[PDB]
Design an enzyme around this catalytic site. Structure first.
Site, PDB file in Angstrom:
ATOM      1  N   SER A 265      -6.693  -6.426   1.886  1.00 46.25           N
ATOM      2  CA  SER A 265      -5.545  -5.784   2.588  1.00 46.25           C
ATOM      3  C   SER A 265      -5.911  -5.409   3.926  1.00 46.25           C
ATOM      4  O   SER A 265      -7.309  -5.035   4.170  1.00 46.25           O
ATOM      5  CB  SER A 265      -4.551  -4.875   2.135  1.00 46.25           C
ATOM      6  OG  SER A 265      -5.428  -3.897   1.469  1.00 46.25           O
TER       7      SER A 265
ATOM      8  N   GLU B  56       2.006   3.476   4.497  1.00 46.29           N
ATOM      9  CA  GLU B  56       0.630   3.275   5.427  1.00 46.29           C
ATOM     10  C   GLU B  56       0.070   4.267   6.329  1.00 46.29           C
ATOM     11  O   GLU B  56       0.917   5.033   6.852  1.00 46.29           O
ATOM     12  CB  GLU B  56       0.632   2.025   6.145  1.00 46.29           C
ATOM     13  CG  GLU B  56       0.887   0.725   5.221  1.00 46.29           C
ATOM     14  CD  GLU B  56      -0.120   0.665   4.091  1.00 46.29           C
ATOM     15  OE1 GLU B  56      -1.403   0.601   4.098  1.00 46.29           O
ATOM     16  OE2 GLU B  56       0.396   0.768   3.051  1.00 46.29           O
TER      17      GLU B  56
HETATM   18 ZN   LIG Z   1      -0.211   0.656   0.963  1.00 42.83          ZN
END
Ligand SMILES: [Zn+2]
Ligand SMILES: O=c1[nH]cnc2c(-n3cc(CCN4CCC(c5ccc(CCN6CCOCC6)cc5)CC4)cn3)nccc12
Ligand SMILES: [Cl-]
Ligand SMILES: [Zn+2]
Length: 337
Positions: A273, A175
């Site tokens: 997300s 991330e």
């Molecule tokens: Zn990801």
């Protein structure tokens, strides 16, 4: 706790599920973070939305045609931004003879088909749509409002929607700022994932640098471009430990700090997300290797050091902070377990 670093699946009760941050701390006490990826199957009674029948005119502003180049398990994905299309238009293309899922018995068969055909007939991914499919009154695991320590920053606190079709892929990456992420598959066909344990992340980076040395010279953190696809067979060949899991509609996936992940969509689906943080992330935030070549998501770590690490604040600003991250250690919030 979880010495094998294998992907764990959790089945919380409605009481356990109600507190998001506490449950993230519980799964860490169990060592889920070691895999870099965990699955959470919410209680049967829980639904974030009553129905997804009113989203045909929802606009996907930047659908991307994914062009994949490569051979022998090593690929580069190129994105071609297409003009805005509605979910109705996207679903029609996704389910059409040209782009629909092939016939298969076991997942292993579909996985072979994905790795054999990812360079052919480029699919369209309705990715990075700013938005949520969560109803306002939903208080449990609301991706639009998780209320973690990440809120201290406040555009990476916001939810994004992903409308997939067969063979759409997300390349190997951690991330932004090596944060955690939450992924909920609202509806449709499954989403398959690959993960490399955080404790083996440097080995994946070394392998990637060896294969794409041109990219490694131009940018230290070239994997953050999200263009690099590496087959599980390649990882197995070069001794990179990894695990795989299939996410089904109504399930959550959690990615942990410095957890490399990749995967693909089985067919027409929708996932939501966002990123989130725990006290454990702060250290990963200060030590994150960022993309240099692109003018990329950067969070100032000052706020987090002056609140949760005031003792090390002066030493860190001086550059004297020589803290080595232990990836096996759970978040301090897991102390109650
Ligand atoms: Zn990801
Ligand atoms: O299914 C995915 N589809 C697309 N992107 C995904 C992803 N990430 C995508 C970003 C970019 C966020 N801006 C970060 N992680 N991580 C995991 C899964 C996915
Ligand atoms: Cl739909
Ligand atoms: Zn870069």
């Amino acid at each position: 706790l979880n010495p094998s670093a294998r992907i764990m699946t959790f089945y919380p009760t409605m009481e356990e599920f109600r507190n998001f941050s506490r449950y993230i701390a519980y799964i860490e006490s169990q060592g889920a973070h070691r895999a870099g990826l965990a699955k959470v199957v919410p209680p049967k009674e829980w639904k974030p939305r009553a129905s997804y029948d009113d989203i045909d005119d929802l606009v996907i502003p930047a659908p991307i045609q994914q062009l994949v180049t490569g051979q022998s398990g090593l690929f580069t994905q190129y994105n071609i931004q297409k003009k805005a299309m509605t979910v109705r238009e996207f679903r029609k293309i996704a389910n059409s003879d040209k782009y629909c899922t092939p016939r298969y018995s076991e997942f292993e068969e579909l996985e072979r088909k994905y790795w054999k055909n990812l360079t052919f007939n480029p699919p369209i991914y309705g990715a990075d749509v700013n938005g949520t499919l969560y109803e306002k009154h939903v208080d449990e695991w609301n991706i639009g409002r998780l209320r973690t320590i990440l809120d201290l920053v406040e555009g990476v606190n916001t939810p994004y929607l992903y409308f997939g079709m067969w063979k759409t892929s997300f390349a190997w990456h951690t991330e932004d700022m090596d944060l955690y992420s939450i992924n909920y598959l609202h509806f449709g066909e499954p989403k398959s994932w690959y993960s490399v344990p955080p404790e083996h992340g440097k080995r994946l980076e070394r392998l990637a640098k060896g294969f794409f040395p041109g990219s490694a010279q131009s940018c230290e953190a070239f994997l953050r471009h999200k263009m690099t696809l590496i087959s599980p067979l390649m990882l197995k060949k070069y001794g990179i430990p990894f695990d795989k899991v299939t996410q089904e509609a109504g399930e959550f996936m959690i990615t942990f700090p410095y957890g490399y992940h990749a995967g693909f969509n089985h067919g027409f689906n929708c996932a939501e997300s966002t990123n989130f943080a725990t006290r454990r992330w702060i250290e990963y935030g200060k030590q994150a290797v960022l993309c240099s070549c692109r003018k990329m998501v950067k969070i100032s770590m000052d706020v987090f050091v002056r609140k949760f690490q005031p003792e090390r604040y002066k030493l860190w600003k001086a550059g004297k902070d020589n803290t080595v991250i232990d990836h096996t250690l759970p978040t301090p919030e897991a102390a109650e377990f």
